[PDB]
Amino acid sequence: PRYLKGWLEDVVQRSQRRPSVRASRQRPIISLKERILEFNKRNITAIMAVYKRKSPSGLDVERDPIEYAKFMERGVVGLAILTEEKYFNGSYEDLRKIASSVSVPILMWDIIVKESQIDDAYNLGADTVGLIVKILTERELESLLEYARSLGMEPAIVIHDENDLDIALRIGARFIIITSHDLETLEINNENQRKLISMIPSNVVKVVASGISERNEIEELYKLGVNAFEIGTSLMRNPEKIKEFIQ
């Protein structure tokens, strides 16, 4: 990984040490990227709900993971499940239970630094993972992107800024998450969001993550050509908002 400081440096060490999990998957991979393109074609709003009990910015909630996933299943294009353990209070067990219990594609949301975590996502039943340009060197991103593809996954490459986007396009990303989360400060910062969306080429499926809490926000972003929307903290607090997002 890159040289890092702070809570991200802690998580990267934790990820580096994390043992490979005993698990095996119960259905073939379903491409999240392709399901997004199918929603788009059907003129259906494509929401990726996130399951997480805690977040480094302070979310703290208890909700049963299988009940949340089944509630969400009919409304979402897919689910992102936290498996990072310390700051999000997730676990691979949450992903094992969810991916065996619902039919929609699953992204395993974690800080991925090594091939064996991608093997963990595959063996736990996930269809894809995020690879974060701020964590990884360009060489490690190329290597992990190819490794994920070799398992039949198309990973989402996560970007925060223009330097990240230049790397994501150079390595041949076809699936990007644009996040407004500042890893320092841990605040939502949308100042570059519109510019970055406008710089993503036609061959790349784009998803936004930015503390979305209103249908109006999704509406405005869809007009800019965003394909799907990662929504986490608002749905963890009020799951019933899924209707407002997709009605």
Q: Is 226 in the site for ligand 0CT (CB under 6 A)?
A: no
Element (H, E) at 130: strand 128-132
Smallest separation (angstroms) from ligand 0CT to the CB of 168: 13
Q: Give CA–CA dist 52/63, Å, rounded.
A: 9
Q: Is 246 in the site for ligand 0CT (CB under 6 A)?
A: no
- Among the listed residues 77, 130, 136, 171, the single contact to ligand 0CT using CB under 6 A: 130
CA distances from 73 to 48, 161, 204 (A): 10, 31, 25
* Closer by beta carbon to ligand 0CT, 22 or else 137: 137
- Among the listed residues 69, 132, 200, 228, the single contact to ligand 0CT using CB under 6 A: 132
- Among the listed residues 36, 49, 158, 231, the single contact to ligand 0CT using CB under 6 A: 158
Q: Which residues inside 56-95 make contact with ligand 0CT, applying CB under 6 A? A: 80
Residue 165 · residue 200 · CB < 8 Å: yes
Give the interface size with ligand 0CT as a residue count (CB under 6 A): 9
For 75, half-sphere exposure in the C-beta direction (CA atoms, 13 angstrom radius) is: 20
Task: Look at the block and give the residue holding tokens 């969001």.
Answer: 193
Q: Give CA–CA dist 237/74, Å, rounded.
A: 19
Lay out the site mask for ligand 0CT across 102-121 (x = CB under 6 A, - = otherwise): -------x------------
Helix (H, G, I), strand (E, B) or coil at 237: helix
**Cα 207 to chain centroid, rounded:** 9
Binding-site ranges for ligand 0CT (CB under 6 A) = 80, 109, 130, 132, 158, 177, 179, 209, 230
